[PDB]
A paper describes a structure:
In a double-blinded, placebo-controlled phase 1 human clinical trial, the recombinant, germline-targeting envelope glycoprotein (Env) trimer BG505 SOSIP.v4.1-GT1.1, adjuvanted with AS01B, induced bnAb precursors of the VRC01-class at a high frequency in the majority of vaccine recipients. These bnAb precursors, that target the CD4 receptor binding site, had undergone somatic hypermutation characteristic of the VRC01-class. To verify that VRC01-class mAbs elicited by GT1.1 do not just exhibit similar sequence features to VRC01-class bnAbs but also target the CD4bs in a similar manner and with the same atomic contacts, we selected five mAbs for further structural characterization.
Moreover, VRC01-class bnAbs have very distinct and targetable genetic and structural characteristics. Specifically, they have restricted immunoglobulin heavy chain variable region alleles (IGHV1–2*02 or *04) and a short five amino acid light chain complementarity determining region 3 (CDRL3). Finally, GT1.1-induced VRC01-class mAbs are structurally extremely similar to VRC01-class bnAbs. A subset of isolated VRC01-class monoclonal antibodies neutralized wild-type pseudoviruses and was structurally extremely similar to bnAb VRC01.
Author numbering:
A (entry chain P): 1 to 52, 52A, 53 to 82, 82A, 82B, 82C, 83 to 100, 100A, ...
B (entry chain R): 3 to 9, 11 to 25, 31 to 91, 96 to 210
Write the structure that this text describes.
């Protein structure tokens, strides 16, 4: 049987390097090409390159040339792929896939379980800005890492509160929005959003009014 | 270089068609939190284990993947690949629960944020099934790609999906443009929310 078992999950920092293995068994290691494809969380597949296990020749992608190196080991039948100058946008799951045969080299009939890389970087106190209305909320922008606890009136209001999931920005910082539904009542009730981020020890209360 | 429809869905037992506009064509099925698997190779051929209810074709510059007799396992992402180029992807849903139109709420940048030389358009989408939207920001009728950061749908507490999209803008361009819009498409259903400064 054909199996592709990769290395465990890794955490790196901006500028660091990570090496991912791909253990192969049950087939001719040097008779089929090995390809590496990455996929960011919530994004599509992106081909990175292929390496011939026989002649150790590689054909990297244009956008990854000069940054990715692919090697192979005949004795342990393991393919390797090392990427340098990692950034916050390089957080992706990396799979190693096998070319089915000699003639067909792109219909990957076997895939690995994947190796999640988590390029890690600057923590930061969140920036809270009110969202005037009806619906009113608060914007938790440029914070890292997850999670952030958002409440209203120190937990007095819990109905109609929707804490939307944060977005992984291109800068590596998350942005979360939590809003409430009100009869609009705006002039009578006072609304204050309490955001607490334990990793950076930041707790700021902002009052939202029209 | 391969374009796919953002969303496509059908009831259990229906059939759906997924386009791929860009040689051979191959398709992949990827369940959430799982590795992609080949279901279609060499235009229309199928590997072992793929049931006969999967089929493909190509007529001109566009190839189509059709799944007949939809099952719960078919609810997954689907991509078309030509050699090394991969498509945008298509989200397939077996209409598990009753359909629900998305709810859209758009918030302009706050006064406090503008004082810090920053501006962000917060567009919020909630209570929509299937979980697949198409957000395209419009600046006086012209779409803008830079600064667009859109999440992926996630399960709510009521079996529906929620998502959020943000358009980061500078104060100078926010004031220059007359208005901005958050157009979201849910399988051909486009609803536009427009906000304007001041």
């Amino acid at each position: 049987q054909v199996q592709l078992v990769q290395s465990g999950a890794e955490v790196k920092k901006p500028g660091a390097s990570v090496k991912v293995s791909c253990k192969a068994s049950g087939y001719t290691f040097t008779g089929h090409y090995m390809h590496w494809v990455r996929q960011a969380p919530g994004q599509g597949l992106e081909w990175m390159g292929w390496i011939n296990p026989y002649s150790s020749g590689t054909n990297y992608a244009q956008n990854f040339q000069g940054r990715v190196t692919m090697t192979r080991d005949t004795s342990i039948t393991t393919a390797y792929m090392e990427l340098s100058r990692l950034r916050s946008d390089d957080t992706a799951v990396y799979y190693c896939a096998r070319a089915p045969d000699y003639g067909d080299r792109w219909d990957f009939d076997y895939w690995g379980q994947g190796t999640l890389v988590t390029v890690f970087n600057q923590i930061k106190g969140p920036s809270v800005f009110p969202l005037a209305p009806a619906a009113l909320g608060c914007l938790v922008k440029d914070y890292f890492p997850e999670p952030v606890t958002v409440s209203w009136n120190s937990g007095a209001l819990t109905s109609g509160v929707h804490t939307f999931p944060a977005v992984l920005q291109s800068s590596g910082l998350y942005s979360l929005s939590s809003v409430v539904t009100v009869p609009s009542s705006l002039g009578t009730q006072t609304y204050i959003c309490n955001v607490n981020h334990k990793p950076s020890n930041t707790k700021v209360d902002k009052k939202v009014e029209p | 270089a391969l374009t796919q429809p953002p969303s496509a869905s059908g009831s259990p037992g229906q059939s759906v068609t997924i386009s791929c506009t860009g040689n051979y064509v191959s398709w992949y099925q990827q369940h959430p939190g799982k590795a992609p698997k080949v279901i279609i190779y060499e235009v229309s051929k199928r590997p072992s284990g793929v049931p006969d209810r999967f089929s493909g074709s190509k007529s001109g510059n566009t190839a189509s993947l059709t799944v007949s007799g939809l099952q719960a396992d078919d609810e997954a992402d689907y991509y078309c690949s030509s050699y090394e180029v991969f498509g945008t992807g298509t989200k397939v849903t077996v209409l598990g629960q009753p359909k629900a139109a998305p709810s859209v709420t758009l918030f302009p940048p706050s006064s406090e944020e503008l004082q810090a030389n920053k501006a962000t358009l917060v567009c919020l989408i909630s209570d929509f099934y299937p979980g697949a939207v198409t957000v395209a920001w419009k600046a006086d009728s012209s779409p803008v790609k830079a600064g667009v950061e859109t999440t992926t749908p996630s399960k709510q507490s009521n079996n529906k999906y929620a998502a959020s999209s943000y358009l980061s803008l500078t104060p100078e361009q926010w004031k220059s443009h007359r208005s901005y819009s958050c157009q979201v498409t849910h399988e051909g259903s486009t609803v536009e929310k427009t906000v304007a400064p001041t």
